[PDB]
Structure 1
Amino acid sequence: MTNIQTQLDNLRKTLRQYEYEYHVLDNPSVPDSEYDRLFHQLKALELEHPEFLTSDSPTQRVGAKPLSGFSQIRHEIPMLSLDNAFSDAEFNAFVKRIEDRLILLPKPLTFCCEPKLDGLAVSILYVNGELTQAATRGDGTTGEDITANIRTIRNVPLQLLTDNPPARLEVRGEVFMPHAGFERLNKYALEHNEKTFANPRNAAAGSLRQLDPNITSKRPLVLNAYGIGIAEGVDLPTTHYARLQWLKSIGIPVNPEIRLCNGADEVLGFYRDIQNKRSSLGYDIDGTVLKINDIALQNELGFISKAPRWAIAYKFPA
């Protein structure tokens, strides 16, 4: 044991907890200045005692050397797309089809509802709580390794906040740029005679394809987690909402507008609520994502492979 190793451990623990409170809870317990006091105290100590420098320390987000080219990653579990709807009648027809397709339709039929963000789909791997890899969705089967870029995102934890993390946990989410950050960036680009971005989605997409992590770090990107891929060494909750609440309780940023709605008319109320809140969110959204909440019902319903919307095979009963 040494005093300096204990001082580093305590600084890192404290700093990870303040990041959680600021980014995930939106209720920091100390001012920004106090966080910064400790952050550069940790950075200086680590540089004066490099023997105790760790790769997942809060001061190690930015890789000092720009990359040459992104490697390709094949997803262990593929990243699927979502079916879409454009009207209440269409959504009602979607629910009516699930209602008769299910063996036993429960009363109520609960949905986990969230805003649909206008961002870049990513997959982030934590091995025994530590961030080791991150990838773009790409075509859903193969993507680009953007680990160094993802590590610069301030609300992305380099270490899960739990003493017993899963053996492996793959978090899926969307990287986006909030309005305030997007406006700030364009004022900086114009003030420094550089090109501007047409919209927040283009700015986020451009920031994630930078080969220099130092540029990505200056871009105000935010992750919002909406799913889980691989999950080894853990008993995931049996509802989709409980799984998102579990991600949040271990340090992962999740959207705070997520709700549970019983039946189509409540789900339609949420859609109109979110539609009315658009002017006040501070980030771009394209719609709402409505999912069956009960996990056993999702498994029972399953997936639809790449198929035309204009054909259907009405099979005979045995």
Structure 2
Amino acid sequence: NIQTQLDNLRKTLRQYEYEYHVLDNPSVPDSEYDRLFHQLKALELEHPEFLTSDSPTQRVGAKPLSGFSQIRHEIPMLSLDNAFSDAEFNAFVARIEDRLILLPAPLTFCCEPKLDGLAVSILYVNGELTQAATRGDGTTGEDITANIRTIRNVPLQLLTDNPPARLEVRGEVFMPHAGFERLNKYALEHNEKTFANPRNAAAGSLRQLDPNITSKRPLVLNAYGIGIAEGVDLPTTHYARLQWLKSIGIPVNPEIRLCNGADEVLGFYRDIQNKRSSLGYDIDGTVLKINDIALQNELGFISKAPRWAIAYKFPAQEELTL
């Protein structure tokens, strides 16, 4: 029947979107994805009663919002403390060593690039994207659902036949250098406001009231974690949770690594610092996390921040000189 044919084309598109944006390993040429997007759109136009709200053709709201509504996160987020030196980082490891009851040998960290963008939270209900918000201050943010729906590597439907009852994906939205340079060039040509750096371009784009404008902004999500998680037994380490997010079609940064012990973690920090803008987008620092979730829970938090993670920040771009 027509409905099943429609759903088979949409499923095919969602698989190509996963391969291209999440796996970075497309199985078909762009031209095939393009023509299939056209074919789906033509069939939906012939049968509009079968349009679905999570179809690949439905990313872009037709009208601008009047303003952003405030959102209170259902589960507030911790704040993240910063380290700026190797001594600060080693002090943070030592506090863990001094607090854990049974200190494993080695102590594994999941180590991530800290994307220079805007932090966001995206809620999927029985697999469907239903709302998204800015992180804000970790307690209150703004509802940016219509903007987040435009982002090409953000799935509208999770890639699984058995999605959690509810899943909150937390991540950073950023704008790679090439897109950022195109945006600034377009803006100057039209005498519209430009952006001082990609971080501000990503933040300003996510506060664009008209999602037709936001769709033209080349934004990318990289997920860093999970809040609400109902009807799902999540893996017991953070890195396996990230691999699981990838498995269901959520984009995660490919430079994340497991590191054993303080010294390997500093190896990671120095390596990503060397790559802080050679990968085609800006990385602000690293977020270094105890990988084992039971150890995270044991370690807890103080003053709003986990004892089990630290952001070891690079020097600001303006400190980098001859």
Question: Which shows bigger deviation, 150-159 or 181-190?
Answer: 181-190
Whole-Å Cα distance in 2 between the matches of residues 260 and 227 of structure 1? 15
TM-score by length of 1: 0.94
SS at match of 1:135: strand
Hey, what does 1:126 align to over in structure 2? 124
Over 3 Å counting, the alpha-carbon distance change for 1:49 and 1:129 in structure 2 is: same
Q: CA deviation at 1:190?
A: 2.0
CA distance in 2 between counterparts of 1:244 and 1:30 reads 26
Question: How far does residue 310 in structure 1 lie from its aligned partner after superposition?
Answer: 19
Deviation at 1:65, TM superposition (A): 1.2
C-alpha spacing 1:237/1:88, structure 2 compared with 1 (3 Å): same
Which whole-Å CA distance do the structure 2 matches of 1:252 and 1:63 have between them? 22
Alignment length (residue pairs):
316
Q: CA offset at residue 308 of structure 1? A: 14
Judged with a 3 Å threshold, the aligned counterparts in structure 2 of structure 1 residues 260 and 314 are, in CA distance, closer, same or farther, namely closer
> 1:315/1:117 Cα in 2 relative to 1: closer, same or farther (>3 Å)?
closer
CA RMSD of aligned residues (A): 5.3
| Contact 2:83–2:310 (8 Å) recurs in 1 | no
Secondary structure of the structure 2 residue equivalent to 1:169? strand
Q: Does the C-alpha gap of structure 1 residues 311 and 158 become closer, same or farther in structure 2, counting only changes over 3 Å? A: closer
Task: Give a deviation string over 1:146-174, Cα, whole Å, max 9, x none.
Answer: 10000000000000000000000000001
Task: Give the share of equivalent positions with the same residue, in percent.
Answer: 99
CA distance in 1, matches of 2:53, 2:192: 33
Q: Matched residues in 1 for 2:173 and 2:253: separation?
A: 12
1:208 to 1:310, Cα distance in 2 relative to 1, 3 A: closer
Unaligned runs of 5+ in 2: 317-322
Q: After the TM superposition, which of the residue ranges 262-271 and 6-15 deviates more from structure 2?
A: 6-15
Q: In structure 1, what is the Cα distance between the partners aligned to 2:315 and 2:198?
A: 50
Q: Quick one: structure 1 residues 162 and 315, their matched pair in 2 at CA, closer, same or farther if it must change by over 3 Å?
A: closer
User: How has the CA–CA distance of structure 1 residues 99 and 44 changed in structure 2, closer, same or farther, with 3 Å as cutoff?
Assistant: same
Residue 206 of structure 1 and its aligned partner are, at CA, apart by 0.9
Cα distance change of structure 1 residues 288 and 213 upon mapping to structure 2, 3 Å threshold: same
For residues 125-154 of structure 1, give each alpha carbon's deviation from its aligned partner in whole angstroms, at most 9, with x where no partner exists. 000000000011112111111100000000
Residue equivalent to 1:75: 73
Structure 1 residue 250: Cα displacement: 0.3
- Deviation string, structure 1 residues 74-120 (Cα, Å, up to 9, x no partner): 11111222111111111111101110111111111000001111111
Write the deviation string for residues 258-309 of structure 1: whole angstroms up to 9, x where unpaired.
Answer: 0000000000111111112224211111111100001100000001124999
- Match of 1:56, SS state, is coil
Partner of 2:320: none
Task: Classify 1:199/1:312 alpha carbon distance in 2 versus 1 (closer, same or farther; 3 Å).
Answer: closer
Q: Is the 8 A contact 2:83 2:313 kept in 1?
A: no
Write out per-residue CA displacement over residues 233-267 of structure 1, whole angstroms, 9 at most, x where no aligned residue. Answer: 00000000000000000000000000000000000
The 1:60/1:109 distance shift into structure 2, 3 A limit, reads same
For residues 311 and 110 of structure 1, do their structure 2 counterparts lie closer, same or farther at Cα, with a shift above 3 Å needed?
closer
Contact 2:175 2:199 (C-alpha < 8 Å) held by counterparts: yes
Map 1:144-155 → 2, pairs under 5 A: 144-155=142-153
- Name the CA shift for 1:13/1:86 in 2 (closer, same or farther; >3 Å): same
* 197-206 or 308-317, which deviates more: 308-317
Once the 2 structures are TM-superposed, how far is the Cα of residue 193 of structure 1 from its aligned partner?
Answer: 2.8
- After the TM superposition, which of the residue ranges 227-236 and 276-285 deviates more from structure 2? 276-285
Aligned mates of 1:231, 1:95 — CA distance in 2: 29
For residues 26-65 of structure 1, what are the alpha-carbon distances to aligned partners after superposition, in whole Å with 9 as ceiling and x for unaligned? Answer: 1111111111101011111111100110000000000101
Q: Which has the larger radius of gyration?
A: 1
Distance 1:145 1:79, change over 3 A: same
- Contact 2:79–2:305 under 8 Å retained in 1: no
- 304-313 or 170-179: bigger deviation: 304-313
Cα–Cα, structure 1 residues 290 and 49, in superposed 2: closer, same or farther, change >3 Å?
Answer: same
Residue 67 of structure 1 deviates from its aligned partner by: 1.0
Aligned to 1:49, which of 44, 47, 50?
47
Q: Which residue of 2 aligns with 1:116?
A: 114
Runs of 4+ in 1 over 4 A off after TM superposition: 306-318
* 1:192 Cα offset (Å): 2.6
Going from structure 1 to structure 2, the CA distance change for 1:61 and 1:97 (only over 3 Å counts) comes to: same
Cα gap change, 1:302 to 1:43, in 2 (>3 Å): same
1:154 & 1:311 partners in 2: Cα distance? 30
Mapped to 1, the partners of 2:41 and 2:314 lie a distance apart of 68
Report the Cα offset of residue 7 of structure 1.
2.2
TM-score, scaled to structure 2: 0.93
- Deviation at 1:313? 24
